[PDB]
C-alpha cells in the first residue's frame, strides 16, 4: 500500500541507534524525532482499524528487538524505551493481531532474550516485561511449554545455584495467572513445580521481596487441588524461621491465607503440627509475631475448624487449661 510503506519506513527509522558525540542540538533534535515517530505509531496502531498487515509483523518485532534486547548496566533513555514497550504492547493487544502470522517472528530466541531483560534493576521496565510476557504466553500456545521451562530454569538458578535475580516477583505474578487457569485434573509437571520449585523459594533470604506473589501461587495451587496441602503446609513449617524473627509475620500471613481455602478433611491432617508452631508464635518474645498469631482467632472460618477439632487443638494452645 502507501500507508503501509510509511509505517514500515518509520518502524525502520526507529531501528537507528544514533549518538551525536559533540553536537547537543543535533542530538536533541534526533531524539525528539524518534520520540515523535514512536508516539505517532502508538496512536496510529491503537485507534486505527486494519492497519496491522502481514508485512508489518517482521518490522515491529525487529524494531523491538534492536531497541530492547541490549546489555543491562550493573536506564537514562527510558522515555524512548517506554514508548517501544507501549507500542509493542498495543501491537499484541490489537484485535487485528494474528498469532498465526506473528509466531514466525516471535520465537523461542525472542522469548529467551525477553526473559533476560527481567533482570533489569528498573521496576518500571520489569512491569512492562511482566505485561508483555503474560500476553505472549496467552496468545502463543506453541510457546507456553518453552516459557514455563525457562522460568523454571531461572528459579532453580536462583535457589540452588547462586544467581541473584531482580524479577522473581514479576515472574511469580505471571505464573499466578497461569496457575489460576489450569485444567481440571492437574498435570504432574505442575505438581512437581509446586513441590520442587515454589516451596524451596521460601528458603532464600531475599524472600521479603517476592513473598506476597509466592504466597498467591501456593494458595492458587491449593484451590485447584486440595490434595497438595499436606506437603505444602509441612514444607512451610520446615522452612519456618527457627530463629525468632519478624520474618515470621510473612509465614503467618501465608499460613492464614492457606487456611482460608483449606478443606476440613485436609485440615485435620496437619492441624497438630501447625498449632504447635502457632502456639510458639503466641509465646514469642517479639510482640509483632505474637500479635499476628493472635489475630488468627478473628478468622471466623478458622474458628469453625478449631471448634470441630477443639479436643485436639485446645490442649495445644492452652496446655495449663486443657489436656488430652
Amino acid at each position: 500500500a502507501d500507508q503501509e510503506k510509511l509505517f514500515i519506513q518509520k518502524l525502520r527509522q526507529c531501528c537507528v541507534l544514533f549518538d551525536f558525540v559533540s553536537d547537543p542540538l543535533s542530538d536533541l533534535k534526533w531524539k525528539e524525532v524518534k520520540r515523535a515517530a514512536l508516539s505517532e505509531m502508538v496512536e496510529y496502531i491503537t485507534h486505527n482499524r486494519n492497519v496491522i498487515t502481514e508485512p508489518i509483523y517482521p518490522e515491529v518485532v525487529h524494531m523491538f528487538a534492536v531497541n530492547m534486547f541490549r546489555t543491562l548496566p550493573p536506564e537514562a533513555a527510558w522515555p524512548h524505551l517506554q514508548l517501544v514497550y507501549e507500542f509493542f504492547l498495543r501491537f499484541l493487544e490489537s484485535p487485528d493481531f494474528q498469532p498465526n502470522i506473528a509466531k514466525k517472528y516471535i520465537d523461542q530466541k525472542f522469548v529467551l532474550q525477553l526473559l533476560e531483560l527481567f533482570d533489569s534493576e528498573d521496576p518500571r521496565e520489569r512491569d512492562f516485561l511482566k505485561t508483555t510476557l503474560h500476553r505472549i504466553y496467552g496468545k502463543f500456545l506453541g510457546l507456553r511449554a518453552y516459557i514455563r521451562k525457562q522460568i523454571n530454569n531461572i528459579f532453580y538458578r536462583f535457589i540452588y545455584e547462586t544467581e541473584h535475580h531482580n524479577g522473581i516477583a514479576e515472574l511469580l505474578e505471571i505464573l499466578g495467572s497461569i496457575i489460576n487457569g489450569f485444567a481440571l485434573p492437574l498435570k504432574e509437571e505442575h505438581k512437581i513445580f509446586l513441590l520442587k520449585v515454589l516451596l524451596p523459594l521460601h528458603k532464600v533470604k531475599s524472600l521479603s521481596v517476592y513473598h506476597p506473589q509466592l504466597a498467591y501461587c501456593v494458595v492458587q495451587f491449593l484451590e485447584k487441588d486440595s490434595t497438595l496441602t499436606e506437603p505444602v503446609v509441612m514444607a512451610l513449617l520446615k522452612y519456618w524461621p527457627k530463629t525468632h524473627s519478624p520474618k515470621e509475620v510473612m509465614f503467618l500471613n501465608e499460613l492464614e491465607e492457606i487456611l482460608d481455602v483449606i478443606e476440613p478433611s485436609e485440615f485435620v491432617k496437619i492441624m497438630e503440627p501447625l498449632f504447635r508452631q502457632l502456639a510458639k508464635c503466641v509465646s514469642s518474645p517479639h510482640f509483632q509475631v505474637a500479635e499476628r498469631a493472635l489475630y488468627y482467632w478473628n478468622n471466623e472460618y478458622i474458628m469453625s475448624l478449631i471448634s470441630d477439632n477443639a479436643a485436639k487443638i485446645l490442649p495445644i494452645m492452652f496446655p495449663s487449661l486443657y489436656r488430652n
Binding site: 511482566k130 505485561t131 503474560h134 504466553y137 496467552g138 500456545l141 506453541g142 507456553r144 511449554a145 505474578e173 505471571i174 499466578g176 495467572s177 497461569i178 489460576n180 487457569g181 489450569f182 485444567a183
Partner: peptide, 11 residues
C-alpha cells in the same frame, strides 16, 4: 489489578 487468568489448553 491482577493479570487476567490464562486458561490452560492442550499443548
Amino acid at each position: 489489578p491482577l493479570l487476567s487468568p490464562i486458561p490452560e489448553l492442550p499443548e
